[PDB]
mmCIF file with all atom_site columns, C-alpha atoms in Angstrom:
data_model
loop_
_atom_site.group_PDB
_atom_site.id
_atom_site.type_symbol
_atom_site.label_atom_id
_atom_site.label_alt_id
_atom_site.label_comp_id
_atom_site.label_asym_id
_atom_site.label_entity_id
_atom_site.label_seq_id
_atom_site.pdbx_PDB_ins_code
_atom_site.Cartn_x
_atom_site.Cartn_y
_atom_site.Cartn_z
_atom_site.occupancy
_atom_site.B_iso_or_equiv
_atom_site.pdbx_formal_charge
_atom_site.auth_seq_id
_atom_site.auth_comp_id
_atom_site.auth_asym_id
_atom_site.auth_atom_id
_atom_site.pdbx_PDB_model_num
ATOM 1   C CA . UNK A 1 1   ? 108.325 95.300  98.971  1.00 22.80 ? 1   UNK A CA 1
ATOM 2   C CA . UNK A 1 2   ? 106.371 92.857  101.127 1.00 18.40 ? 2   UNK A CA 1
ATOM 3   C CA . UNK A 1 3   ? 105.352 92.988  104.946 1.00 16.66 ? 3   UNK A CA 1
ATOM 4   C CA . UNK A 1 4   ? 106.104 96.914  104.971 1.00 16.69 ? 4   UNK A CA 1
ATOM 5   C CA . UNK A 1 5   ? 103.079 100.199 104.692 1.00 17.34 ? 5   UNK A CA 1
ATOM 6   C CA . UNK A 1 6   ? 102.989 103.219 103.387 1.00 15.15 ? 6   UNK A CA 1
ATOM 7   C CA . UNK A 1 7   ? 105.860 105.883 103.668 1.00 17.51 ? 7   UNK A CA 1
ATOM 8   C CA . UNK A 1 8   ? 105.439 109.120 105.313 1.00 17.94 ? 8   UNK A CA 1
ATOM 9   C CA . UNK A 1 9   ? 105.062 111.542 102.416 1.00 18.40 ? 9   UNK A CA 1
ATOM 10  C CA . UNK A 1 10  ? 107.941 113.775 103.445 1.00 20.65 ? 10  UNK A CA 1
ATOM 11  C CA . UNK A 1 11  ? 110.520 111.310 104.012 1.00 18.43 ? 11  UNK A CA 1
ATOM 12  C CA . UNK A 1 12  ? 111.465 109.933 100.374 1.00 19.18 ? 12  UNK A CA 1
ATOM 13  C CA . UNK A 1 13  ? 112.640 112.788 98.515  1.00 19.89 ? 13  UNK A CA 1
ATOM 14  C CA . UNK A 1 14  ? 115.796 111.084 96.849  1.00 18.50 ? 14  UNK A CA 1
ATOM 15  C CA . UNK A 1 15  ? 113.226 108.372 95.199  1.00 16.76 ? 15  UNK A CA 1
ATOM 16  C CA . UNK A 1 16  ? 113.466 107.978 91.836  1.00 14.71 ? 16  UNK A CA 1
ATOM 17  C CA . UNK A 1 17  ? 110.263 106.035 90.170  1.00 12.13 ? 17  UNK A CA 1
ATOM 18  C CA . UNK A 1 18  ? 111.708 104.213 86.632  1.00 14.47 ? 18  UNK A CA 1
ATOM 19  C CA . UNK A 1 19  ? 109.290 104.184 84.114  1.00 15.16 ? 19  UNK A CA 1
ATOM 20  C CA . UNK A 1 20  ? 108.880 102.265 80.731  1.00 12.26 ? 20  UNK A CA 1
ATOM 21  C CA . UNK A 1 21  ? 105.778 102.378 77.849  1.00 10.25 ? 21  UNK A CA 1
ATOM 22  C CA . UNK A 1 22  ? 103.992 104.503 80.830  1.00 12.05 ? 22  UNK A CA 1
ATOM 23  C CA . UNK A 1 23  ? 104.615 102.151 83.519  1.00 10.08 ? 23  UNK A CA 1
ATOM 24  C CA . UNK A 1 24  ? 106.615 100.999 86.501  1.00 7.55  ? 24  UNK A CA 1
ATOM 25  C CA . UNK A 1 25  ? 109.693 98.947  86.109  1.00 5.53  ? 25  UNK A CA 1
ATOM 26  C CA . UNK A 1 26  ? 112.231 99.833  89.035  1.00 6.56  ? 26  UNK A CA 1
ATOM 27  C CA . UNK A 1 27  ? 113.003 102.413 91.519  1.00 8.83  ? 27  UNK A CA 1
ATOM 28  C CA . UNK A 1 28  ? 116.290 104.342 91.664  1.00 11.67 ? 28  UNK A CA 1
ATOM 29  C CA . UNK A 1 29  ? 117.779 107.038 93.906  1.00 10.07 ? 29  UNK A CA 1
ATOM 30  C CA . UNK A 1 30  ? 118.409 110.490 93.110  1.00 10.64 ? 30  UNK A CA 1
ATOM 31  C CA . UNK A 1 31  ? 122.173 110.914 94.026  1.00 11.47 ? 31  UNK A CA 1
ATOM 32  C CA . UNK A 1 32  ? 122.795 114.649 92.107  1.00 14.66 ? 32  UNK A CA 1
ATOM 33  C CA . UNK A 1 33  ? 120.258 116.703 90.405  1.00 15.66 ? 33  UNK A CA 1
ATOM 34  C CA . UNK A 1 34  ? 121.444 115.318 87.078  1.00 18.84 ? 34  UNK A CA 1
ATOM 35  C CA . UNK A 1 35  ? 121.951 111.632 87.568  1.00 19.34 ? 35  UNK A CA 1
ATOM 36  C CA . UNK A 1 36  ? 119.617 108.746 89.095  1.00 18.28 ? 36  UNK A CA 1
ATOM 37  C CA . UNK A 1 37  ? 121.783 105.415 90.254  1.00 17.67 ? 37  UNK A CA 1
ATOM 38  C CA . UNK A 1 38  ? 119.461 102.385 89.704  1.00 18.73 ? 38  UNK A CA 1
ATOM 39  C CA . UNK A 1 39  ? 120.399 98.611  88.966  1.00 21.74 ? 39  UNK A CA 1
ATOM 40  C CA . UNK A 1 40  ? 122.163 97.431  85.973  1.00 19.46 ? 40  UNK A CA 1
ATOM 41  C CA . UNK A 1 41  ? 119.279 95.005  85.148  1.00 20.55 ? 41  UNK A CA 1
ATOM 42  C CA . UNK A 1 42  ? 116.786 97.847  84.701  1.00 21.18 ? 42  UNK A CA 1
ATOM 43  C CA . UNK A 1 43  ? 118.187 98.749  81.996  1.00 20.14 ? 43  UNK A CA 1
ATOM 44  C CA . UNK A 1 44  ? 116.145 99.115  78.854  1.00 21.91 ? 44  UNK A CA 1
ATOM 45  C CA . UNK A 1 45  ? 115.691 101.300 75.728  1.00 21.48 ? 45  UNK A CA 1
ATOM 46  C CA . UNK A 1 46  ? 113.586 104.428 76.339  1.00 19.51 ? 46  UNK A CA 1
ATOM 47  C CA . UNK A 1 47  ? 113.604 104.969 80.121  1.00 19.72 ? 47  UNK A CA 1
ATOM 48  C CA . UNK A 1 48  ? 111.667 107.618 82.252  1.00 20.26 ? 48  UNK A CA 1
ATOM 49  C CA . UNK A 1 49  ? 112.481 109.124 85.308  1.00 20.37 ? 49  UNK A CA 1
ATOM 50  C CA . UNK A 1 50  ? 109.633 110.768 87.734  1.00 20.54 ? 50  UNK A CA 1
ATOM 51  C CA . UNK A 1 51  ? 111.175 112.462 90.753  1.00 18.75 ? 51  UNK A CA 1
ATOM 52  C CA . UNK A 1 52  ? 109.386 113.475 93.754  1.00 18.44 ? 52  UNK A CA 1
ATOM 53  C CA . UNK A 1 53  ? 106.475 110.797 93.305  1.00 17.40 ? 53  UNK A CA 1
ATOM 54  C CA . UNK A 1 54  ? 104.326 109.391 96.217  1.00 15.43 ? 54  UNK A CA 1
ATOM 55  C CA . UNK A 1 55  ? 100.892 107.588 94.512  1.00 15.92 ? 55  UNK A CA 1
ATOM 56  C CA . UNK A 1 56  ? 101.848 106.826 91.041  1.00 17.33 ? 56  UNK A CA 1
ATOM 57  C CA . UNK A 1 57  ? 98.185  107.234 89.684  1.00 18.64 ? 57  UNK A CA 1
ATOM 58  C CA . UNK A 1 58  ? 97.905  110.693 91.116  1.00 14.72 ? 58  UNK A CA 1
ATOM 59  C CA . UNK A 1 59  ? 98.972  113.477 88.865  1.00 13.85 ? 59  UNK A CA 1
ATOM 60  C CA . UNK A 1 60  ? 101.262 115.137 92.164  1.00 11.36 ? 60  UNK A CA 1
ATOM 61  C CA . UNK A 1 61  ? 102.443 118.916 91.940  1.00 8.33  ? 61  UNK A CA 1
ATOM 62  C CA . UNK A 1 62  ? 105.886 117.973 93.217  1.00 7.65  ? 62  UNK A CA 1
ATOM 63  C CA . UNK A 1 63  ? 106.726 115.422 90.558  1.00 4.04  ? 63  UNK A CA 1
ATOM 64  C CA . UNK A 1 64  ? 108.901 115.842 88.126  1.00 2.77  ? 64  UNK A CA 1
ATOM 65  C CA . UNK A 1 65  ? 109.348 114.069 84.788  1.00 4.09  ? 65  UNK A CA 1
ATOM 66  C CA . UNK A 1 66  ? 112.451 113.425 82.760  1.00 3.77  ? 66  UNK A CA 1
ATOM 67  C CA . UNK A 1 67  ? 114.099 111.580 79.894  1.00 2.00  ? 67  UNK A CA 1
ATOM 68  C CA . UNK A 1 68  ? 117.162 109.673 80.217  1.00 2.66  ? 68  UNK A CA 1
ATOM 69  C CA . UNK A 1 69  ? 119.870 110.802 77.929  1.00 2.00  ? 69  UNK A CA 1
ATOM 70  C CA . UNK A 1 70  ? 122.073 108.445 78.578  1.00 2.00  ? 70  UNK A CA 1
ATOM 71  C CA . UNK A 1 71  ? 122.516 105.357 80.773  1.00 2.00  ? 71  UNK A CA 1
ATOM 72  C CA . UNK A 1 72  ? 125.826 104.063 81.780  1.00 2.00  ? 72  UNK A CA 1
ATOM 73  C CA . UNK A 1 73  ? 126.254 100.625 82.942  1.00 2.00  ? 73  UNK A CA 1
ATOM 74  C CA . UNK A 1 74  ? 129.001 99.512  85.333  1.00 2.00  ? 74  UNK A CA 1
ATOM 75  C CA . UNK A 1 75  ? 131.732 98.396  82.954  1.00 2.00  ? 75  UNK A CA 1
ATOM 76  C CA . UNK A 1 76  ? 132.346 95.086  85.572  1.00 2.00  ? 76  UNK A CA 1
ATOM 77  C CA . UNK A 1 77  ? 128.498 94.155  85.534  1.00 2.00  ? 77  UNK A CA 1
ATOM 78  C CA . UNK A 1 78  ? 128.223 90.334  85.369  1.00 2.00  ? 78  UNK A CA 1
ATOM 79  C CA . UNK A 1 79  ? 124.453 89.882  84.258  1.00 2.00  ? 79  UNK A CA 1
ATOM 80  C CA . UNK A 1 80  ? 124.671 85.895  85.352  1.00 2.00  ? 80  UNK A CA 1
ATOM 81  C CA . UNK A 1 81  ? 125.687 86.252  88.408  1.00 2.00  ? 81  UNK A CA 1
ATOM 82  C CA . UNK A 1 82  ? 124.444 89.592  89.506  1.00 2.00  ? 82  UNK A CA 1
ATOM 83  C CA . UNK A 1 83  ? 127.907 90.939  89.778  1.00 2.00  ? 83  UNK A CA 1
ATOM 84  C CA . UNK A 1 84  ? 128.448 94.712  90.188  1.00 2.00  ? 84  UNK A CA 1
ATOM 85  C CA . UNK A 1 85  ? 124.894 95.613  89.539  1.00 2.00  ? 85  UNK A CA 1
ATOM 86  C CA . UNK A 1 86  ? 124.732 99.214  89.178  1.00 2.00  ? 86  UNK A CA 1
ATOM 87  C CA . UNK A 1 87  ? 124.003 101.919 86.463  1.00 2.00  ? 87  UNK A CA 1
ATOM 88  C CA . UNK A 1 88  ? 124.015 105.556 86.160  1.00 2.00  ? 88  UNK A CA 1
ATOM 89  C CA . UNK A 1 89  ? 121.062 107.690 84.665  1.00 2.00  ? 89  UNK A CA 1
ATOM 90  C CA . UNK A 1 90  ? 121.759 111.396 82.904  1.00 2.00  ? 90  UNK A CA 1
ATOM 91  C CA . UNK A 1 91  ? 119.159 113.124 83.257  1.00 2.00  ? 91  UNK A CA 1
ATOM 92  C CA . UNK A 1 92  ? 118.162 115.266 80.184  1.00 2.00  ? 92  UNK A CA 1
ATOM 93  C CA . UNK A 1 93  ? 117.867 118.475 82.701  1.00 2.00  ? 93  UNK A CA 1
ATOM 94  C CA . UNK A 1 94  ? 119.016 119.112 86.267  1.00 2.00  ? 94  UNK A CA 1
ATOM 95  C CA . UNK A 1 95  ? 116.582 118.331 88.652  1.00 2.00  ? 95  UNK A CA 1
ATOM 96  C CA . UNK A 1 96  ? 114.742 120.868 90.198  1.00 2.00  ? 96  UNK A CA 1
ATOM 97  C CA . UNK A 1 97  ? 115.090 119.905 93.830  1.00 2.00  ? 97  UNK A CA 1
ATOM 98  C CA . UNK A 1 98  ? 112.390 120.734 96.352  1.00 2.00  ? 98  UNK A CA 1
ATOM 99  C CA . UNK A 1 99  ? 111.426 119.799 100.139 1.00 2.10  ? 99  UNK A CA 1
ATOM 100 C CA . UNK A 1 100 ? 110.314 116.790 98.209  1.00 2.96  ? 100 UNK A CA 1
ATOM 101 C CA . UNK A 1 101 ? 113.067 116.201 96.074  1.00 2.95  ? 101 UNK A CA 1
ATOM 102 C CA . UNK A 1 102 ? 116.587 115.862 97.018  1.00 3.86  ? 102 UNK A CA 1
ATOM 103 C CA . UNK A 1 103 ? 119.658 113.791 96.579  1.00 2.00  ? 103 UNK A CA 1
ATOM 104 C CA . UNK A 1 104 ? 120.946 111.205 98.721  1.00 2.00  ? 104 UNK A CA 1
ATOM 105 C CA . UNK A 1 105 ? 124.687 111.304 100.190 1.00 2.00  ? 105 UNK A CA 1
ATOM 106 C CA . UNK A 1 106 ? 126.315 107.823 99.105  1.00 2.95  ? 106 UNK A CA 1
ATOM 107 C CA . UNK A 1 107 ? 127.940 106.006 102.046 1.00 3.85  ? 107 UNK A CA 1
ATOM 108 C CA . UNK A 1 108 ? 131.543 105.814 101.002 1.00 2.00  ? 108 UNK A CA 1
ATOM 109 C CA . UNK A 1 109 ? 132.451 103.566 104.204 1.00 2.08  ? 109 UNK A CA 1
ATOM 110 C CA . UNK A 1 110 ? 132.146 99.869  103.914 1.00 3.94  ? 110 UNK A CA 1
ATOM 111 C CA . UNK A 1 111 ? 132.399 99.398  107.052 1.00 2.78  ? 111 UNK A CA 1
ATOM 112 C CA . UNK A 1 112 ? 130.187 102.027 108.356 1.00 3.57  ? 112 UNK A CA 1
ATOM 113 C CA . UNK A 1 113 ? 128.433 100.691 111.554 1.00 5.07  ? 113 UNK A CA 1
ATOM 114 C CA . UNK A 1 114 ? 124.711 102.063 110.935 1.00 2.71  ? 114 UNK A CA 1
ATOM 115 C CA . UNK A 1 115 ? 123.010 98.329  110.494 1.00 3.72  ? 115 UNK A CA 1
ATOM 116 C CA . UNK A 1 116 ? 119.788 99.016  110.828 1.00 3.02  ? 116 UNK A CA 1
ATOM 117 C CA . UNK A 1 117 ? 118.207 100.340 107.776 1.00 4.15  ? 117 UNK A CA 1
ATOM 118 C CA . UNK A 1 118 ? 115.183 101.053 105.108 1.00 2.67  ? 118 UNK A CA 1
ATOM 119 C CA . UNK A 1 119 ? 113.756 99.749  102.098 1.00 3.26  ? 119 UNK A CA 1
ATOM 120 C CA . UNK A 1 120 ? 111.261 101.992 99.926  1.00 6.57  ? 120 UNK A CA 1
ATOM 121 C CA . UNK A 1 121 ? 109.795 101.538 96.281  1.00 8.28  ? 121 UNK A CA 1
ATOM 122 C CA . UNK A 1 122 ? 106.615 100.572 94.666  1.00 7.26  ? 122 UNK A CA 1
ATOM 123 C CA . UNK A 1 123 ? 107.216 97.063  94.184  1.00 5.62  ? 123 UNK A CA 1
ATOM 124 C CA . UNK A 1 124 ? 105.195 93.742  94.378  1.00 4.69  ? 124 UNK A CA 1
ATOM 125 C CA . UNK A 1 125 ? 103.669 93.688  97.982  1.00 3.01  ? 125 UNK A CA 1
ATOM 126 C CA . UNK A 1 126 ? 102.667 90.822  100.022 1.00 2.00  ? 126 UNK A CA 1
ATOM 127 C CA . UNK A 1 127 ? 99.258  90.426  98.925  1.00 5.42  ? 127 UNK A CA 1
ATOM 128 C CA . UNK A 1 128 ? 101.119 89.438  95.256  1.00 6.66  ? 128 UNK A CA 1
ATOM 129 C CA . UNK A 1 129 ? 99.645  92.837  93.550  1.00 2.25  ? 129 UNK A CA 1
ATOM 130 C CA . UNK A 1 130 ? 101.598 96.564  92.822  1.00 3.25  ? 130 UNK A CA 1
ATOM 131 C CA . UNK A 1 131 ? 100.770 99.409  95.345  1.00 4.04  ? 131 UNK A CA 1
ATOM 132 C CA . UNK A 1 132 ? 100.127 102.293 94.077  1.00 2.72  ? 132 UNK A CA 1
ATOM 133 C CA . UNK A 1 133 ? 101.645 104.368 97.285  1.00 2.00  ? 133 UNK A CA 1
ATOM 134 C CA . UNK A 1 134 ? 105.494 103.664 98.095  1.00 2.00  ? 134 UNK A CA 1
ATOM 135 C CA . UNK A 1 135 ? 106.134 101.347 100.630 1.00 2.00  ? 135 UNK A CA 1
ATOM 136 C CA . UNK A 1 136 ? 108.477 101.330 103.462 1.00 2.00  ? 136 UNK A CA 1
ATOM 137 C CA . UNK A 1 137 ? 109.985 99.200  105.646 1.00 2.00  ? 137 UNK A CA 1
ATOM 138 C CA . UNK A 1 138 ? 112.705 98.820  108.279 1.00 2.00  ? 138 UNK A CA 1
ATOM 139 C CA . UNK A 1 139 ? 115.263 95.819  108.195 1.00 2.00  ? 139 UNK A CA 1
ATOM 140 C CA . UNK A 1 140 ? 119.118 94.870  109.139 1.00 2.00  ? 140 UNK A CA 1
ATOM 141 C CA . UNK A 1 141 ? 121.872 94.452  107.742 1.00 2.00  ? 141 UNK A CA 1
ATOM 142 C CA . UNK A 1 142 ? 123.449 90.713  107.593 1.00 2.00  ? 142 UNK A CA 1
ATOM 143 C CA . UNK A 1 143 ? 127.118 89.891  107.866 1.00 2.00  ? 143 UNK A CA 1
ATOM 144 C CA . UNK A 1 144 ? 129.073 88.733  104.721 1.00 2.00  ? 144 UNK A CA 1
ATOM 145 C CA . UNK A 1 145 ? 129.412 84.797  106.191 1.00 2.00  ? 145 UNK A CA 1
ATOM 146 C CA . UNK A 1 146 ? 125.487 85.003  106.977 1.00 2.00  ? 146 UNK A CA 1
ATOM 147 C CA . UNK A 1 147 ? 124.558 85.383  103.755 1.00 2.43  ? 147 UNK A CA 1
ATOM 148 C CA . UNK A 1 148 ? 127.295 83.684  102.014 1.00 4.88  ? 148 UNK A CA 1
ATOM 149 C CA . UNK A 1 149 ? 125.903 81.071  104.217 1.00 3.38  ? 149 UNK A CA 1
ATOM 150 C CA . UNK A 1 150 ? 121.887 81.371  102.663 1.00 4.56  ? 150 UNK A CA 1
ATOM 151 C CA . UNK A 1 151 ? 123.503 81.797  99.092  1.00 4.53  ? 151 UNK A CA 1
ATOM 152 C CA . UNK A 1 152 ? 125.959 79.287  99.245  1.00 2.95  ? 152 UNK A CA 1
ATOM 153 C CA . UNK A 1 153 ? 129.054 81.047  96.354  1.00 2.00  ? 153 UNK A CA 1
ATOM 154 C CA . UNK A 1 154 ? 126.846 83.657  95.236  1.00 2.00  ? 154 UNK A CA 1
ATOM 155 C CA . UNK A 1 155 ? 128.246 86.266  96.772  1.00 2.00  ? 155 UNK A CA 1
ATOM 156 C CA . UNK A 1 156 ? 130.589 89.035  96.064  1.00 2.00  ? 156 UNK A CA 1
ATOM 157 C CA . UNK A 1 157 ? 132.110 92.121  98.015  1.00 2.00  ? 157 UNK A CA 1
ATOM 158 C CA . UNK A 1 158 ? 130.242 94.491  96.073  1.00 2.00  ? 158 UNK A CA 1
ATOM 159 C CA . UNK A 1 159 ? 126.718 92.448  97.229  1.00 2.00  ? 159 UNK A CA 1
ATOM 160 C CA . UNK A 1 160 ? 125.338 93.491  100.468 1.00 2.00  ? 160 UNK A CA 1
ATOM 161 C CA . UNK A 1 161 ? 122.416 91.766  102.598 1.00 2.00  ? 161 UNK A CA 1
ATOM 162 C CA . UNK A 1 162 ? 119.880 92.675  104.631 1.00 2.00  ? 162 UNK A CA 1
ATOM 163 C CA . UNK A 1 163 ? 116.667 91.197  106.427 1.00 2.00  ? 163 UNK A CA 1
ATOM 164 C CA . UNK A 1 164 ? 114.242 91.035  108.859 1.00 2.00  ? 164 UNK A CA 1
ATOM 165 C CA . UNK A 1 165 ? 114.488 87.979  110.853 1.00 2.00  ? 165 UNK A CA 1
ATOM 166 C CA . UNK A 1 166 ? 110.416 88.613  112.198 1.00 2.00  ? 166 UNK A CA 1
ATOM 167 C CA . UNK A 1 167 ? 108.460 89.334  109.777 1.00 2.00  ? 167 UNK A CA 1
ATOM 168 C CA . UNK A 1 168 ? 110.720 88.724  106.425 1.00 2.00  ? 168 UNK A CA 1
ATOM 169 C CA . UNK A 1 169 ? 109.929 92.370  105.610 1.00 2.00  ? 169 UNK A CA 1
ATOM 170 C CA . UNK A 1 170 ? 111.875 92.703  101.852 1.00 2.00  ? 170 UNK A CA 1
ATOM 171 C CA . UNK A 1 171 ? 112.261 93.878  98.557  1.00 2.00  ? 171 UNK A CA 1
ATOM 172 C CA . UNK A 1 172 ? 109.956 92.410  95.842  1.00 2.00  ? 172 UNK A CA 1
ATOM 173 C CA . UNK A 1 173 ? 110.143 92.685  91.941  1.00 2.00  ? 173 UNK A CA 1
ATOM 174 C CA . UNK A 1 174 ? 109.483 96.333  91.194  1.00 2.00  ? 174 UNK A CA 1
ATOM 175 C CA . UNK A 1 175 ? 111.757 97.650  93.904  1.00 2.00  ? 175 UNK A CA 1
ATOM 176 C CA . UNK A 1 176 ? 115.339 96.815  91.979  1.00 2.00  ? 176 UNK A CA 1
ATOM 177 C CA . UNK A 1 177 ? 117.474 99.680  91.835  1.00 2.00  ? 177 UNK A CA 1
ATOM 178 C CA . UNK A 1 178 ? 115.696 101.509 94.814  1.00 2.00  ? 178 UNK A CA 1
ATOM 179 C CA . UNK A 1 179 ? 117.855 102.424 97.732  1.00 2.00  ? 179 UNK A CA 1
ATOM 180 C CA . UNK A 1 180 ? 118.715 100.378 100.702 1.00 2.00  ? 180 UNK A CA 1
ATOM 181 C CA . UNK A 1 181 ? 119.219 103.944 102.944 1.00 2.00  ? 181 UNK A CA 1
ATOM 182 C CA . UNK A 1 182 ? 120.922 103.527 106.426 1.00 2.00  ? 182 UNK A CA 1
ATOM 183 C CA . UNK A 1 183 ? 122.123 106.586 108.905 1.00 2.00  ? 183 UNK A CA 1
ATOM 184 C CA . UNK A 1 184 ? 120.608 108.784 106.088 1.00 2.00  ? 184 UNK A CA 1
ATOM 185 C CA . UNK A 1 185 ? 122.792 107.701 103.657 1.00 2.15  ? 185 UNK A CA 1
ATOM 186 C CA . UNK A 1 186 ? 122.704 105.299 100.538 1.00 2.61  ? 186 UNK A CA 1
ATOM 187 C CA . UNK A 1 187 ? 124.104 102.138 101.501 1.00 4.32  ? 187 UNK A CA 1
ATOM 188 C CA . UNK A 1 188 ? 122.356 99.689  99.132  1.00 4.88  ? 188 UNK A CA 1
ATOM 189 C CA . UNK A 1 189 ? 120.470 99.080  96.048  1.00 2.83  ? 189 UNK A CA 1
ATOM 190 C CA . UNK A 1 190 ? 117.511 96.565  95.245  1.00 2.99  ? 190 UNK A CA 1
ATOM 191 C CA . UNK A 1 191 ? 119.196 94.045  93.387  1.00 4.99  ? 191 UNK A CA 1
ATOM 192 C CA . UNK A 1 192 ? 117.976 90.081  94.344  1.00 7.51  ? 192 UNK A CA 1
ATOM 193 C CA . UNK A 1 193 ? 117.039 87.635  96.610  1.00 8.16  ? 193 UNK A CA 1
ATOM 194 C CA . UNK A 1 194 ? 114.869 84.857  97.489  1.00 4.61  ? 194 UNK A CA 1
ATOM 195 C CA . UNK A 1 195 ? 112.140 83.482  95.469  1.00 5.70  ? 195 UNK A CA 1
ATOM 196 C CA . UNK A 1 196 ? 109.338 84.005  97.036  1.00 8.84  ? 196 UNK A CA 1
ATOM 197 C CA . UNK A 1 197 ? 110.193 87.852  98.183  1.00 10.58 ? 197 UNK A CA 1
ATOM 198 C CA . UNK A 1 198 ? 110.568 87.355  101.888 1.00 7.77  ? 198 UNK A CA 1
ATOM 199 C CA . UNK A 1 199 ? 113.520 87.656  104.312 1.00 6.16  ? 199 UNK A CA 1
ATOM 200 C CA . UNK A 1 200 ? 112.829 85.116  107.302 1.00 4.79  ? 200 UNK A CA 1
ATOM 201 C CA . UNK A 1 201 ? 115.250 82.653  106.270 1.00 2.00  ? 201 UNK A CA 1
ATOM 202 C CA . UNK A 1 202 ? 117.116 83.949  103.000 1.00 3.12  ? 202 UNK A CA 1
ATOM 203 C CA . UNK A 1 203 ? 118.046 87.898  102.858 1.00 2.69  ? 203 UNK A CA 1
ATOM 204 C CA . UNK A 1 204 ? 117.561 90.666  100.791 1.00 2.00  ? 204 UNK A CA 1
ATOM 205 C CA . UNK A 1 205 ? 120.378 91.170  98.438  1.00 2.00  ? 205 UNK A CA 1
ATOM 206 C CA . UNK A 1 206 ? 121.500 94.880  97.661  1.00 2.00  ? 206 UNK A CA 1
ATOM 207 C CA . UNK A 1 207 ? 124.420 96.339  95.384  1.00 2.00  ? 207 UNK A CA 1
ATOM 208 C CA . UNK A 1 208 ? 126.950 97.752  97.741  1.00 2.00  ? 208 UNK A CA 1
ATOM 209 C CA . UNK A 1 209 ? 127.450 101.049 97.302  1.00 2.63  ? 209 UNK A CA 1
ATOM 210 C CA . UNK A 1 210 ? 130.232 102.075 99.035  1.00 2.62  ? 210 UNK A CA 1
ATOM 211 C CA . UNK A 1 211 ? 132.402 100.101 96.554  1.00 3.00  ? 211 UNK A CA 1
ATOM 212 C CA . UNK A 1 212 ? 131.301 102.415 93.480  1.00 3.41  ? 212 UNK A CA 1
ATOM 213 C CA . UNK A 1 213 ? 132.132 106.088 95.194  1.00 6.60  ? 213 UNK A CA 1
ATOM 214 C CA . UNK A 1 214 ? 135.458 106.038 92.505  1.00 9.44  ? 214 UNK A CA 1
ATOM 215 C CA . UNK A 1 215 ? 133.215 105.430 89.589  1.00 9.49  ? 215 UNK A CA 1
ATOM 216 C CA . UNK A 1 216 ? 130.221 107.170 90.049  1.00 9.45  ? 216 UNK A CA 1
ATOM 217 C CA . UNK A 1 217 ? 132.884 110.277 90.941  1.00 9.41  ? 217 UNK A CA 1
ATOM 218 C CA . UNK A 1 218 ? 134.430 109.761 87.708  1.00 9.70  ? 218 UNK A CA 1
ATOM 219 C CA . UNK A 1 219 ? 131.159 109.131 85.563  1.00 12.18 ? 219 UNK A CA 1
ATOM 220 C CA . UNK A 1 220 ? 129.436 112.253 87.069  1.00 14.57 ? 220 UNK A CA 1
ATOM 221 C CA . UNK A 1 221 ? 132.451 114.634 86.732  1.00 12.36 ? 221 UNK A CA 1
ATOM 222 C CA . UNK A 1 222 ? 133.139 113.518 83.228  1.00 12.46 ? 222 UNK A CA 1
#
């Protein structure tokens, strides 16, 4: 994520760190201690979950590593278009949770009136290179006709944006399926936005969770 710093190391338990061939693809958000929610488009053969990262090159005592069993896309997900652009991830074993990890409560209110929120992952910062601690940032949410207005029939009701007007503070590639986390609970995930990462003029645009508490319910108590 570009124009953000370094997290504090005791406020990110719920990240989720997706790994590939021994190396950083996406973020996600631990949401129960056997399932991570990430984006649709991370999907790939052979995922790995860390839990309770904070550098990714150090070897950290409260990480934990763990194979994904099996990965459930959202049965609506529109690849094109970015449509519905959310996936669950079992976990091969619960989660052992820790001051360091910890689910996040979903927001199940679409129109919950926290707007100001935060970003976190390990994505691309603004220098164009891969951090190696998480970054964090603070931005706001935008209204539905704002951003329908920067990306002109691109969005949907299960799309959510957010920016920062001042500094353009956003998610860069790297940070999909990370959470978009406002009044302590998961609002958003990393899903698109403008090309190059930067929210001055064109927002952030995050998978809106509130619109998935019926199917991640029913996937989880399956």
């Amino acid at each position: 994520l570009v124009h953000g710093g370094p997290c504090d190391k005791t406020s990110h338990p719920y990240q989720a760190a997706l790994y590939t061939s021994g190396h950083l693809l996406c973020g996600g958000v631990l949401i129960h201690p056997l399932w991570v929610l990430t984006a649709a488009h991370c999907k790939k053969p052979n995922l790995q979950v860390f839990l309770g990262k904070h550098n990714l090159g150090q070897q950290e005592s409260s990480q934990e590593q763990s194979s994904v069993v099996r990965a459930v896309i959202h049965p609506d997900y529109d690849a094109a278009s970015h449509d519905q652009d959310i996936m669950l991830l079992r976990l091969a074993r619960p989660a052992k949770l820790s001051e360091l990890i910890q689910p996040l409560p979903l927001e199940r209110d679409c129109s919950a009136q926290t707007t100001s929120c935060h970003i976190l992952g390990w994505g691309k910062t603004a220098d164009g290179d891969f951090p190696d601690t998480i970054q964090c940032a603070y931005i706001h949410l935008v209204s539905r006709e704002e951003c329908e207005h920067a990306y002109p029939g691109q969005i949907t009701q299960n799309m959510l944006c957010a920016g920062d007007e001042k500094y353009g503070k956003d998610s860069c590639q790297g940070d999909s399926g990370g959470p978009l986390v406002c009044g302590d609970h998961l609002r958003g995930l990393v899903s698109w936005g403008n090309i190059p990462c930067g929210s001055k003029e064109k927002p952030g645009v995050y998978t809106n969770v509130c619109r998935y508490t019926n199917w991640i319910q029913k996937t989880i108590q399956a």
